[PDB]
Amino acid sequence: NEVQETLNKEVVQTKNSEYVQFESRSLLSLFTVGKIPPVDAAALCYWGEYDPEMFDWSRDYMIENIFENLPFWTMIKQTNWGRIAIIALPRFVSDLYSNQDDAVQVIIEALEMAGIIGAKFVSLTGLIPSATDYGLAITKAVANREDLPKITTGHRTTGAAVVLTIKKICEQGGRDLSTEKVGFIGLGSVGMNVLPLMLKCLPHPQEITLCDVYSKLEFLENIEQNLVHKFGFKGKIKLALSKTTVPQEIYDSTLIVGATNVANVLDIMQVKPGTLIVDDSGPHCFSVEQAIKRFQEREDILFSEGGMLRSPFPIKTTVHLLPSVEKIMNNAQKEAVFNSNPFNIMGCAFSALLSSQFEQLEPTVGICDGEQSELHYQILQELEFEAGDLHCEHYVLPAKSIANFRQRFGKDLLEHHHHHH
Amino acid sequence: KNSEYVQFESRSLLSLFTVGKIPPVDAAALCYWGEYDPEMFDWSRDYMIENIFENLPFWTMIKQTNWGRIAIIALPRFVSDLYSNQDDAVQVIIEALEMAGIIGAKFVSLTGLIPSATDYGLAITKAVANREDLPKITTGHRTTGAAVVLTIKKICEQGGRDLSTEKVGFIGLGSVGMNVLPLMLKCLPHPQEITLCDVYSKLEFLENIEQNLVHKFGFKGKIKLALSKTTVPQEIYDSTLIVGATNVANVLDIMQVKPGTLIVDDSGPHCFSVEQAIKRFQEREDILFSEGGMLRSPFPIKTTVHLLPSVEKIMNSNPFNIMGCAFSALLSSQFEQLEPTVGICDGEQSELHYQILQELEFEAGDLHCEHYVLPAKSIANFRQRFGKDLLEHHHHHH
Numbered sequence: 101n102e103v104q105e106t107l108n109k110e111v112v113q114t115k116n117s118e119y120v121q122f123e124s125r126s127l128l129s130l131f132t133v134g135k136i137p138p139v140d141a142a143a144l145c146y147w148g149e150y151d152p153e154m155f156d157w158s159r160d161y162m163i164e165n166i167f168e169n170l171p172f173w174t175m176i177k178q179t180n181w182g183r184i185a186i187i188a189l190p191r192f193v194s195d196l197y198s199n200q201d202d203a204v205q206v207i208i209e210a211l212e213m214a215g216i217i218g219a220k221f222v223s224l225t226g227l228i229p230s231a232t233d234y235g236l237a238i239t240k241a242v243a244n245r246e247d248l249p250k251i252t253t254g255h256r257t258t259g260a261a262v263v264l265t266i267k268k269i270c271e272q273g274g275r276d277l278s279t280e281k282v283g284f285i286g287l288g289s290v291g292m293n294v295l296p297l298m299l300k301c302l303p304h305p306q307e308i309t310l311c312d313v314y315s316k317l318e319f320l321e322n323i324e325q326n327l328v329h330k331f332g333f334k335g336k337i338k339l340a341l342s343k344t345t346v347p348q349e350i351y352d353s354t355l356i357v358g359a360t361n362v363a364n365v366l367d368i369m370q371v372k373p374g375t376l377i378v379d380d381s382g383p384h385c386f387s388v389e390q391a392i393k394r395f396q397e398r399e400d401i402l403f404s405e406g407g408m409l410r411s412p413f414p415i416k417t418t419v420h421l422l423p424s425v426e427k428i429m430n431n432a433q434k435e436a437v438f439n440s441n442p443f444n445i446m447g448c449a450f451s452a453l454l455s456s457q458f459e460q461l462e463p464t465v466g467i468c469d470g471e472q473s474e475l476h477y478q479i480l481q482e483l484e485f486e487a488g489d490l491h492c493e494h495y496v497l498p499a500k501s502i503a504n505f506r507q508r509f510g511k512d513l514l515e516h517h518h519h520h521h
Numbered sequence: 522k523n524s525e526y527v528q529f530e531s532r533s534l535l536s537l538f539t540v541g542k543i544p545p546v547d548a549a550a551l552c553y554w555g556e557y558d559p560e561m562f563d564w565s566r567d568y569m570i571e572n573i574f575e576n577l578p579f580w581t582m583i584k585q586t587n588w589g590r591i592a593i594i595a596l597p598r599f600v601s602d603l604y605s606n607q608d609d610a611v612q613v614i615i616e617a618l619e620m621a622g623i624i625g626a627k628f629v630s631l632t633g634l635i636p637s638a639t640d641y642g643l644a645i646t647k648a649v650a651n652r653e654d655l656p657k658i659t660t661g662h663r664t665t666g667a668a669v670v671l672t673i674k675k676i677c678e679q680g681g682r683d684l685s686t687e688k689v690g691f692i693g694l695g696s697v698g699m700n701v702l703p704l705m706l707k708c709l710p711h712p713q714e715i716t717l718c719d720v721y722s723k724l725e726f727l728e729n730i731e732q733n734l735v736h737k738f739g740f741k742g743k744i745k746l747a748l749s750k751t752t753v754p755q756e757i758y759d760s761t762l763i764v765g766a767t768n769v770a771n772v773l774d775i776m777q778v779k780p781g782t783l784i785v786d787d788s789g790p791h792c793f794s795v796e797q798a799i800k801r802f803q804e805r806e807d808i809l810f811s812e813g814g815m816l817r818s819p820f821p822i823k824t825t826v827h828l829l830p831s832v833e834k835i836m837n838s839n840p841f842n843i844m845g846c847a848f849s850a851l852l853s854s855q856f857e858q859l860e861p862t863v864g865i866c867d868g869e870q871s872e873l874h875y876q877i878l879q880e881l882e883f884e885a886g887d888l889h890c891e892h893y894v895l896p897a898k899s900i901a902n903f904r905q906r907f908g909k910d911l912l913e914h915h916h917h918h919h
């Protein structure tokens with residue numbers, strides 16, 4: 101009988117706030133009949149990673165019969181500067197690493213759908229750049245086609261969000277960046293945008309530690325030369341180097357900036373009392389659960405996502421869940437959508453909307469021109485954007501706990517703890 | 522079995538189009554879900570509209586012909602919903618016209634009883650107003666009329682009977698029928714006798730047709746006027762060829778037509794019982810009866826079929842056949858001489874549809890009725906048993 105389903109659809113509709121709206125019907129269909137206006141940009145995402153027991157299907161069955169090897173338009177972000185479509189590729193993250201040619205093919209199919217619904221630029225979110233030669237494998241295949249929207253890794257806007265987060269975690273921590281020992285764990289695409297931008301827009305730190313794998317020794321040595329001769333960093337520069345896990349010199353840092361794609365390299369239980377942690381990674385370079393545990397028990401650290409932006413005006417999100425997956429889902433999973441901060445938007449996805457509104461913000465393929473992120477940073481300030489409030493995945497750091505941290509590990513107070521004697 | 526001309530696709534045609542796996546179409550045709558049957562679905566009528574159809578148009582077929590591509594799009598409505606709420610019917614149609622435009626359709630046919638429920642297109646043209654971003658609509662009734670005349674030609678040919686010595690009875694002279702009668706008198710030998718049958722409300726309308734027959738159409742045979750209260754009057758059963766084009770079903774009793782009668786019926790649903798016509802044919806081979814609006818292409822058509830997945834869980838056409846109404850939209854997109862039709866029209870240009878179909882070597886579909894094809898051997902037996910000289914020598918079961 102059909103009474104439970106019509107009431108369940110009444111619950112999500114009568115709970116649609118002014119800024120979060122579920123829609124049970126296909127966004128693609130609604131767009132084609134004229135009930136959904138076109139978008140100015142889009143962002144591509146994947147279905148995370150497959151649990152054998154989150155879903156009752158096999159991984160191969162999901163790809164073939166649930167996703168049907170087709171991109172799925174799942175969200176719309178309505179902002180004061182345009183509309184962004186969120187399009188899920190019919191793949192998990194491990195599928196994109198094991199077959200790059202297939203990943204490129206399904207991306208191009210999604211680029212064509214993105215053009216139909218109006219997108220002029222398309223962001224590659226998450227680990228998609230890492231698996232597609234940072235966009236280069238896609239650009240080679242699009243060749244001389246001009247019918248498709250232009251791609252972007254968005255990492256210049258992501259780098260701006262990380263520096264905005266560095267600015268915000270220091271303020272809320274009651275600390276000054278010029279007296280921090282900043283450690284960078286992994287200098288990859290985003291890290292190559294954060295480090296130059298940080299030195300141009302924020303006060304220079306007292307000390308900088310560059311940490312990456314052994315293979316990049318001379319690469320870090322030349323980045324060290326960039327610091328002293330291009331950006332004029334006059335402080336101390338240490339070169340940390342690790343295999344599998346961070347070296348024990350990174351725990352001497354008071355601000356840790358993570359930009360690796362390898363998870364759990366940083367032991368959250370070994371950072372000293374008072375450490376600030378900004379990490380743009382999915383998954384994060386530390387155990388989030390142990391970090392929430394340590395923060396709740398001791399109010400010992402400040403830690404946050406680095407790639408999230410906060411809009412000065414709220415954003416209306418329209419959400420269409422995959423119907424066959426919506427049934428297997430529970431009420432607690434749906435609450436995560438309704439309880440999302442309507443001011444927040446990821447820097448990566450937002451970058452595509454920025455390119456469609458400002459022609460001076462050119463799309464990025466490959467890793468290059470870290471300095472250009474300054475233009476992203478300045479425009480985000482002109483629009484009164486800041487970093488997202490301190491949070492990590494599902495967990496928001498309560499203001500009172502942040503206050504307790506600020507009262508005990510602020511400036512002039514860090515030096516009076518045991519591990520800083 | 523499995524032919525290369527009928528292919529089932531489990532994935533959404535709309536999605537496949539947006540990722541570039543399906544080329545755009547040149548035209549489209551709008552249909553509906555027949556009539557709600559509680560013995561087929563366990564869902565209630567309103568639940569199907571709200572949660573199975575989701576009040577959205579459904580792109581369900583592609584027909585690839587040698588003269589273009591046609592998309593078949595189902596409105597999220599049953600037939601009686603179109604009559605009971607014309608405003609809502611226009612709104613869903615405009616939504617379908619928007620979808621049809623995205624996938625490239627330049628012209629869109631209104632199939633079935635959609636014209637009869639939308640002022641023959643004028644209820645839609647009013648709502649589209651000055652919008653020029655949408656594909657142009659057509660009732661396609663000039664092409665349907667051409668199909669009916671081609672069927673009249675074929676049924677008399679395969680029956681071994683000459684139309685000039687036939688007594689032709691017209692049941693239902695609405696939009697389609699008014700294209701058939703004049704076109705028949707231009708393309709085929711004039712019959713010996715013509716009977717015009719419609720309801721009492723159209724008495725003077727039929728009387729007006731008689732005067733045009735003798736003064737404009739040049740008909741010199743006998744003209745009889747019959748009125749139908751509910752079922753057809755008993756004087757149409759004196760006709761040897763019956764042409765039907767009504768919007769009400771089972772008005773003609775198939776069991777009362779005389780041995781040797783020819784029946785061409787464009788009505789959908791048919792104005793007679795399909796199951797009894799088949800039963801009478803298999804036991805007696807007494808009649809020829811066929812669809813009237815079905816065209817046969819000289820070259821085969823490749824049909825892609827995407828069934829609505831929720832309905833498919835509960836869920837063999839001739840690859841040369843395509844309905845004249847749907848094909849009319851494709852004709853408008855390839856020959857700007859054939860313009861779309863909205864409202865009841867003069868049907869002067871009806872002959873051009875007939876001539877252009879003949880140049881393309883089109884004819885009517887082989888004699889069939891929905892799922893049932895009349896075997897060629899049985900048609901041969903009919904041809905030998907029911908010539909004009911032999912009709913009086915059969916026992917008419919009274």
Ligand SMILES: NC(=O)C1=CN([C@@H]2O[C@H](COP(=O)(O)OP(=O)(O)OC[C@H]3O[C@@H](n4cnc5c(N)ncnc54)[C@H](O)[C@@H]3O)[C@@H](O)[C@H]2O)C=CC1
Pocket residue numbers: 631632633634636637662665692693694695696697698718719720723749750751752753766767768769772787788789790814844846847
């Ligand atoms: N499937 C398709 O693609 C198409 C189907 N058709 C079918 O052709 C038929 C006629 O369609 P239209 O001409 O557009 O509709 P219409 O409503 O203009 O024609 C119906 C006519 O039949 C007459 N009629 C009603 N009850 C009668 C009775 N008991 N005895 C005699 N006459 C009676 C009416 O007065 C009217 O003139 C319908 O069944 C329709 O579904 C027509 C065109 C395309």
